[PDB]
Design a protein around this ligand. Structure first.
Ligand SMILES: Nc1ncnc2c1ncn2[C@@H]1O[C@H](COP(=O)(O)OP(=O)(O)O)[C@@H](O)[C@H]1O
Ligand SMILES: Nc1ncnc2c1ncn2[C@@H]1O[C@H](COP(=O)(O)OP(=O)(O)O)[C@@H](O)[C@H]1O
Ligand SMILES: Nc1nc2c(ncn2[C@H]2C[C@H](O)[C@@H](COP(=O)(O)O)O2)c(=O)[nH]1
Ligand SMILES: Nc1nc2c(ncn2[C@H]2C[C@H](O)[C@@H](COP(=O)(O)O)O2)c(=O)[nH]1
Ligand code: NA
Ligand code: NA
Ligand code: NA
Ligand code: NA
Lengths: 209, 209
């Protein structure tokens, strides 16, 4: 009856097209190489029933009130908690593009919802060991593949989101990484910060502690 | 640029198969007769994308974590706020089977979620003028048409839900109605309590004030 967290849980955050996927795949490949068992997840997961509606929303194929889409994103997060506990419990690590901090930055920055009201439903989600924030200025990524395809990918929106991410900018678990560099440079900083991680089984923590 | 609430907003609450639909249809028919324009709504609304998943959940055709289904119910509530404001603004009344109080009683009573965590996401929903609680004891309705068809319709669950409804039992807007009587008796009590309602345009209020 051991229910200690054995794996470590790592989150990449950032504006749209900031290299989250690139970096998280790199981190994953590096951990498989160094023999850590690891599982790559991401939010939103567009493949569930809730995910499908989220996806129609991001493509501007439907529309919905600000409150409804926020709660759907949060529900999509909650449908992964058993899977996430499961893995962590098994000592498999979890590397995830996006988490609840996306809730605040996007729902509070782009959709102007109250910050506290946005955080409430995500309260009690599993807390990660570290979040890497791939920091790029609001106008930086407008030229990368496909940008502007989904609803929030306009620089003026990216500005507000960028401003709203600051709400976590000075937290302990939060590591600003300059993502205006070469892929390999970003990657080594991440690997370096990952190596400074304690490997011991511990208790789970929960948002927003 | 008038944005006063003109209509009145009435909610029926109660355990499963307690006569909500019966009473709300009666109230509606009575208001059309006395020449009030009125719109009958209900939650969950199973016809939207979110509604469809809620519906699969109640039929036990899928399953999901407690947190996810709660947030879907709350999202389903939020997708009706524009429609509800719209009507109230126009002076059309709204009579509704079920609202956010169902969130507490069901999510907190049957699914054992924390009461405050359940209320948070519904905070900011339009507050109704009155809630009629069709009060029946937990074992009372087990013999009415079709009972036991959906997930919460087992007396042991109805017990907890019944206990959890008490959280509103002593509030101002909340009117206990003995629903163990004849349809016509229940109806006259409701009509009598409805006639004691002030007809004047006012400001909107919001949950959980
Ligand atoms: N550091 C970088 N330099 C140049 N191109 C990059 C860099 N990082 C990512 N890209 C490219 O920019 C686009 C966005 O990358 P991606 O990992 O999918 O971002 P995100 O997950 O944030 O949406 C992709 O085409 C990716 O190849
Ligand atoms: N007071 C009553 N006496 C006898 N039968 C009733 C009474 N009220 C409702 N019913 C019947 O019991 C069942 C549940 O009624 P309904 O209005 O659909 O409940 P609810 O909306 O709470 O699910 C229906 O068959 C209804 O006709
Ligand atoms: N409003 C809001 N948007 C979110 C939330 N989580 C993710 N998003 C947005 C961020 C991205 O613009 C978008 C698409 O995701 P992607 O390309 O995978 O990072 O979803 C959330 O919780 N709230
Ligand atoms: N857990 C939970 N259940 C709800 C909520 N709202 C409604 N329900 C349940 C109450 C009823 O059992 C069920 C079916 O609705 P109905 O027959 O229309 O009253 O939905 C909610 O917010 N949370
Ligand atoms: Na994106
Ligand atoms: Na991505
Ligand atoms: Na029911
Ligand atoms: Na009903």
């Amino acid at each position: 009856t051991d229910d200690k967290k054995k794996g470590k849980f790592i989150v990449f955050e950032g504006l749209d097209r900031s290299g989250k996927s690139t970096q998280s795949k790199l981190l994953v490949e590096y951990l498989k190489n160094n023999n850590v068992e690891v599982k790559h997840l991401y939010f939103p997961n567009r493949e569930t029933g809730i995910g499908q509606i989220i996806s129609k929303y991001l493509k501007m194929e439907n529309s919905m009130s600000n409150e409804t889409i926020h709660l759907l994103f949060s529900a999509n997060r909650w449908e992964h908690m058993n899977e996430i506990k499961s893995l962590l419990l098994k000592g498999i690590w979890v590397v995830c593009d996006r988490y609840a901090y996306s809730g605040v930055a996007y729902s509070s920055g782009a959709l102007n919802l109250n910050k506290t009201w946005c955080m409430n439903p995500d309260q009690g989600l599993i807390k990660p060991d570290v979040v890497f924030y791939l920091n790029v200025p609001p106008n930086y990524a407008q030229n990368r593949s496909d940008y502007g395809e989904e609803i929030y990918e306009k620089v003026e929106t990216q500005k507000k989101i960028y401003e709203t991410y600051k709400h976590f900018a000075h937290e302990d678990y939060w590591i600003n990484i300059d993502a205006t560099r070469k892929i390999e440079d970003i990657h080594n900083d991440i690997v370096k910060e990952v190596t400074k991680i304690k490997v011991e089984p511990e208790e789970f923590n929960f948002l927003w502690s």
